[PDB]
Paper text:
Tumor necrosis factor (TNF) is a pleiotropic cytokine with beneficial functions in immune regulation and host defense, but deleterious pro-inflammatory and cytotoxic functions during inflammation. TNF signaling is mediated by binding to two cell-surface receptors: TNF receptor type 1 (TNFR1 or p55), expressed in most tissues, or TNF receptor type 2 (TNFR2 or p75), which is inducible and typically found in cells of the immune system. To better understand and rationalize the activities of the three Nanobodies™, the crystal structures of the complexes of VHH#1, VHH#2, and VHH#3 with TNF were determined. In agreement with SEC data, each of the three Nanobodies™ associates with the trimeric TNF to form a hetero-hexameric TNF-Nanobody™ complex.
The binding area of VHH#2 coincides almost totally with that of VHH#1 despite significant differences in CDR lengths and conformations, and a different orientation of both VHH domains relative to the antigen. VHH#2 covers 745 Å2 of the TNF solvent-accessible surface area, 571 Å2 on one TNF monomer and 175 Å2 on the other monomer. However, the orientation of VHH#2 is more perpendicular to TNF compared to that of VHH#1, which results in a smaller surface area of interaction. VHH#2 is unusual in that most of the contacts with the antigen involve CDRs 1 and 2. CDR3, which normally dominates Nanobody™-antigen interactions, contributes least to the contact surface. The CDR3 of VHH#2 is among the shortest observed for Nanobodies™ and the FR after the CDR3 sequence deviates from the normal framework-4 structure: the C-terminal β-strand is shortened in order for the CDR3 loop to connect with the previous β-strand. VHH#1 and VHH#2 bind to largely the same epitope at the center of the interaction area of TNF with TNFR. Also, the CDR loops of VHH#1 and VHH#2 dock into this groove, although the specifics of the interactions are quite different due to a different orientation of the VHH module relative to the TNF structure. Taking into account the orientations of these termini relative to each other and that a linker needs to avoid steric clashes with the TNF antigen, a minimum linker length of at least 20 amino acids is expected to be required for the VHH#1 bivalent construct, and 18 amino acids for the VHH#2 bivalent construct. For VHH#2-based bivalent constructs, a threefold increase in potency is also observed with the 9GS linker, while a 50-fold increase in potency was measured with a 30GS linker.
Residue numbers in the entry:
A (entry chain A), B (entry chain A), C (entry chain A): 9 to 102, 113 to 157
């Protein structure tokens, strides 16, 4: 049980924000992985499977064309640059539900940080369990 | 080739039900993983990548607002509780197609069971290959 | 750092086609994995996590019902057959955005090839980073 690993969930008690949380039940933040300033911190150099899901929910369709996005970004320790690794966009309106799942394998450096960010936290459905999550595992 | 592994598909011959099946071609149920009462059985304690996809298909939009869901749940041997690990909801109607993909890393115990369940098997498009699947791998 | 691995992206300079590319930054094609005729080539027998995402984007809804598909297929060296491993279909019209994510674990043979293919490259949104990707990792 020594591989760097994390599986964090959106805080169901937060309001209008995507706040990642490690839980006692069915969530992970182990073997060097830390949560700092809402970002996952890589403890060692290597290959990592990185993934995240968000679910957006709205009661109806507003007057202005809504675009939803979910993104996983890499903040390199060496440079402090912030690069898009995985992302997608959805338009729910031409109650609605829009899940977005992202996942991929990346070479990361020790101290690099990962953020999983959205644009419309007012539409984030984080109260319902299993819908909003972010994780990594060293391979 | 010793890691617990499974990649099961929806039985294309089943009717109005999500029935997981191990196939000869491009499907797995090896190294201790069993399929029992339509659920995957964990042979050993450890970290597992768990994933599933379903695809819903309908010919049109009915009079009552349809909600579709896909869920992966953990049945702990120690407790017999059934907890939601990964889930999403979609509303296809404000022929239609709605895929849902779920995936994440979890610490599981030997004898724990995993179920991948939906609410509208009458909308499940399991006849078309590669669309409906459920799998795990010990990491 | 010896596991066969790949994480390739759609060439943002290609036109009306899905052309996979290994990049200097945040992309991989290592430890025996090759890109040949737009397909990933397996260097050794074993279990692989395989995944891909595409994002389709259109300016409006045309007169004929558009169906979008994304598929991951296995070309066996031993047979030259081409089998569907993972796929999904979406109908964007009853500017729109349709992401499709596919991922699963498969036993592959050395020399097998994997293709990640779509039907409407005229709708592929490959100019925007992190949206179109294809990868594998030996587990």
């Amino acid at each position: 049980s020594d591989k760097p690993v994390a599986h964090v969930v959106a805080n169901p008690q937060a309001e209008g924000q995507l706040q990642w949380l490690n839980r006692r039940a069915n969530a992970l933040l182990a073997n060097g992985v830390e949560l700092r300033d809402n970002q996952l911190v890589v403890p060692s150099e290597g290959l990592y499977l990185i993934y995240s899901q968000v679910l957006f929910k709205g009661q109806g369709c507003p007057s202005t064309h809504v675009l939803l996005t979910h993104t996983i970004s890499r903040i390199a320790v060496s440079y402090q640059t912030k690069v898009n690794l995985l992302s997608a966009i959805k338009s729910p309106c031409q109650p609605w539900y829009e899940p977005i799942y992202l996942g991929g394998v990346f070479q990361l450096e020790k101290g690099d940080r990962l953020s999983a960010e959205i644009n419309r936290p007012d539409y984030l459905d984080f109260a319902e369990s299993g819908q909003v999550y972010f994780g990594i595992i060293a391979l």
